[PDB]
Symmetry: D2
Subunit: 245 residues, 4 copies
Amino acid sequence: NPFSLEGRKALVTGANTGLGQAIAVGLAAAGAEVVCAARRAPDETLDIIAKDGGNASALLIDFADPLAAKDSFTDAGFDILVNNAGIIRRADSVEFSELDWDEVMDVNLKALFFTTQAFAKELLAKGRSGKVVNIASLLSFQGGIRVPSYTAAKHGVAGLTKLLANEWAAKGINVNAIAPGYIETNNTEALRADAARNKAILERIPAGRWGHSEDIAGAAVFLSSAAADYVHGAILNVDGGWLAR
Amino acid sequence: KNPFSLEGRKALVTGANTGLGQAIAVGLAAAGAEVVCAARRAPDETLDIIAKDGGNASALLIDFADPLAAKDSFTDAGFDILVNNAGIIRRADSVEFSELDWDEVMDVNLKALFFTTQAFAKELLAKGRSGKVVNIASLLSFQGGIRVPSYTAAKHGVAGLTKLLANEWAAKGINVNAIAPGYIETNNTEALRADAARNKAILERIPAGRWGHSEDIAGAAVFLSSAAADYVHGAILNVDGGWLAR
Amino acid sequence: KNPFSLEGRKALVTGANTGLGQAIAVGLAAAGAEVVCAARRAPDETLDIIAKDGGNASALLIDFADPLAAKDSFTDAGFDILVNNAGIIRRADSVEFSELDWDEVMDVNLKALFFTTQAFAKELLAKGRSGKVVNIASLLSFQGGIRVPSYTAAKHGVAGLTKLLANEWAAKGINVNAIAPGYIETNNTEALRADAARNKAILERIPAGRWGHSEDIAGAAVFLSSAAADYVHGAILNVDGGWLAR
Amino acid sequence: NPFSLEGRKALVTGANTGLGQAIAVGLAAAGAEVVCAARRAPDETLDIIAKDGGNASALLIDFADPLAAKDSFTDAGFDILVNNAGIIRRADSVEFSELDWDEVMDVNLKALFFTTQAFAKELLAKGRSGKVVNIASLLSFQGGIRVPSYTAAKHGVAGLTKLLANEWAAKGINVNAIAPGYIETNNTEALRADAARNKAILERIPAGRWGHSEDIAGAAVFLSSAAADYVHGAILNVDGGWLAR
Ligand SMILES: NC(=O)c1ccc[n+]([C@@H]2O[C@H](COP(=O)([O-])OP(=O)(O)OC[C@H]3O[C@@H](n4cnc5c(N)ncnc54)[C@H](OP(=O)(O)O)[C@@H]3O)[C@@H](O)[C@H]2O)c1
Ligand SMILES: NC(=O)c1ccc[n+]([C@@H]2O[C@H](COP(=O)([O-])OP(=O)(O)OC[C@H]3O[C@@H](n4cnc5c(N)ncnc54)[C@H](OP(=O)(O)O)[C@@H]3O)[C@@H](O)[C@H]2O)c1
Ligand SMILES: NC(=O)c1ccc[n+]([C@@H]2O[C@H](COP(=O)([O-])OP(=O)(O)OC[C@H]3O[C@@H](n4cnc5c(N)ncnc54)[C@H](OP(=O)(O)O)[C@@H]3O)[C@@H](O)[C@H]2O)c1
Ligand SMILES: NC(=O)c1ccc[n+]([C@@H]2O[C@H](COP(=O)([O-])OP(=O)(O)OC[C@H]3O[C@@H](n4cnc5c(N)ncnc54)[C@H](OP(=O)(O)O)[C@@H]3O)[C@@H](O)[C@H]2O)c1
């Protein structure tokens, strides 16, 4: 089965809810051992994986310190990293604060780079292959509004996905990204609660629905598998048609 | 509950006698789809591979020199996966490029791709059935290349149709996506691999440091044809060793 | 030493009787180029505008229903700027889209654009002369739209040719670039502006909050035809009010 | 003349050398008053503009403090901003330091956002129109190698160009970017000195030459002018054909 992840061991950040939860569940169903990284205990995610017969555990980590994972990989045996943890801050750009800039950059971009660096340093030292899946955004391609640090960060994530593939593809680490469309999770709750903005989003989705977190799992399994061994530096949009429209 | 399984599905793969089409047909059959191998000549080698793997496949002889050749191929036929892989390329200095080398490439790579997809979707839409289309694009859907103006124009056109048709049919349950292969080993690329200077220049621009294999394209075609990709619509997935990143 | 001046240059603008082609012809002439206004019918309104501004222009009658119609238009004619603006669009559900609506759009928008550019460049390359090509692309070189499959495929194809021809001819001093207009006020877009719901939906997706003017496209065509853009090759410049950013 | 900048007043950052110098010279030749912002006196740039008969002056500012321009716009009358100041740090990504991350992000991305914010806050308060031209990069589109903070930053600059156009286009501030190709300046000196890397770059440029700083000036005049009033959120590559190839 070229889509099996048996024998792999994944770290999924932001794994307690939303996309990270669905990805952790999907990787475990595909056969990976999954460590569910989160800043609070991923009780529900672990319950779901346990009920499904999968193999998972927790890691508590807080990327407000963007170097928080510096020692997480040494002798730990990870060979899939899903960089899903992320935050957003919404304000008019003319009054956007330094705090809302820095805190978003720290989690979404800086912590993504240094966590990936520590993961790859271990693989490269051990002479092993592995996979990185970054969670990008439609705001890696378009600008959106009122989220300057988020759009800048998510564009940056696409940039790092390309550069790190350029440097590491020949060393056996595939680095790719998924760009989800508009998915119903805590990240988008404020948009969904705004009737006008919600309608404007919905009518720009050719599939005619908001995504569900489970819609992102299949691409994460794929990009972590041998069926994607020649995929490097790609940004795959899983968006109901948004970028086509 | 295997989201990559194609059990119960029925695929038509064009250009299925060789190269990427052969590998895609073999991969779809191994994932559980019944596969009809569309080709100009009997795709016996492809059918033999599938039969040895225990899969279910048959041939359809079709020649896209008539770009409307598939107009009646889908009525009551049960297809719900279409892979538009047949394609050709013609090389000459653009200042001298002939009308024939323009027209013949457009006919197979772009016009036939549209009209074959139209007939496939007509049948699904008429019956309320879901389905999947996977178009084979190229790096030359994104970059220009040289000396192949009808091929670059056609492969850019394929990316455009992938987006428009997704835009029009996503809500009707027809996923339309594309794979853009990079440099993959097939019989048609042996001449590039045999030219030492050209091969070196190609490899220097591939981060992975190797040509792809046809099975790498087959894996992506199974993914985009499966429930694992149900919310993927209008996407162009590059399977390229890093080429476009570099 | 005005890098935007086109004094001494000679341009052919297709579709020059109306809309964007008319504005581009007027803008190039105001920048100092001699302009030949190519059109199916006498471009008298365009010529009158240019004559009142004190510019130098004349007509060429040409019909791209024959996509090779310009094959002999450039020999010894002195053109060193070409703007490929002529284009049409046909709308129908993609599942019903006709071969005629496919072919006629491809012929004008893509095949004629290639062969007209080929003839223009043949003359420059044969003589060692520098020159400029500006292709008129579309938002539908980037996104899909709906119900216009031959137009989206053709305009994606135009972006591809812009890249390939730049790739092949940049070192010979022929700059090949494109402008992708967004939603611009011309006679051909009056029906969209007249449909209140369609117009509202368009405006909601334009950050600038307005339709563009044909003169906005003319300004970009003068820039890309000038020494101010000498290192710009293979670019597709969107002039779109913010559409693609949004 | 739709390309004239008479009556406009521009701030050009990084104006002492390289692309910023050429842009400042080009804007002044088009008729703008140009303030040449730099961390050291832009003696040569001012001499060139003076010889050409243009109107220019200096502003000393150091974006190692990314908020350094917070008070630069109040009652100053700027209505063109060219965000050109930028740095690069080259190292293998597996050993890339936090310092080389943060310092590049500070100048190339964070300072770009907050300088633009202060410029726009003044325009919007005064009810005036204006123009922003950001200097992006080929590494806003591709990954490159060994420059993770630079690629992430320059992707981020493209993202901000789109988002700020989305928010401000209707308020009369055009925000666009130029993505130069490989141009001979101090930024690329280390590449040009490496014979192998230099050759690999050159042979990927269809025009057959490295750019010169003067090749970037015309696009900056254009994007600052009335001839570009409907151009918003665009990233114009001025690259000798690189992205086509
Ligand atoms: N439409 C969408 O939903 C959408 C679209 C595109 C991309 N994304 C991206 O998808 C990813 C997942 O977001 P989501 O939609 O699932 O929304 P979410 O519920 O906000 O998920 C964010 C996850 O990141 C974790 N996280 C945030 N800050 C952290 C920190 N300092 N340390 C450790 N973990 C931290 C969150 O933990 P807590 O639960 O404790 O807050 C949560 O697990 C994010 O990168 C987001 O940008 C979402
Ligand atoms: N391999 C690569 O690196 C690469 C890169 C990017 C994209 N592509 C694209 O991927 C697709 C497959 O490439 P490949 O390398 O496998 O090429 P290939 O070996 O040349 O095979 C092309 C296939 O198309 C069929 N075909 C051509 N003209 C036809 C016609 N008039 N009617 C019916 N079938 C026709 C061929 O049939 P016959 O055998 O009878 O001629 C053959 O099966 C093509 O669209 C190609 O452009 C390939
Ligand atoms: N306006 C927009 O918002 C918009 C947006 C994106 C791209 N575009 C593109 O910009 C270009 C100009 O658009 P427009 O709005 O000005 O359109 P238009 O008013 O429809 O004008 C099209 C021009 O093309 C000429 N043309 C059509 N078929 C021809 C043929 N067989 N032979 C010779 N000339 C022919 C037309 O001549 P006749 O007058 O004799 O028919 C006319 O001059 C087109 O390529 C269009 O697709 C426009
Ligand atoms: N191929 C290329 O040359 C290329 C390609 C794409 C984009 N770019 C971008 O073009 C822009 C200009 O670079 P360049 O090629 O002209 O090279 P450069 O000589 O390195 O120019 C950078 C300019 O930014 C200034 N700067 C750097 N740090 C600063 C700080 N902390 N405070 C104030 N000013 C600071 C520099 O001042 P000093 O002179 O005092 O160091 C110099 O004026 C940069 O954003 C660069 O990323 C260059």
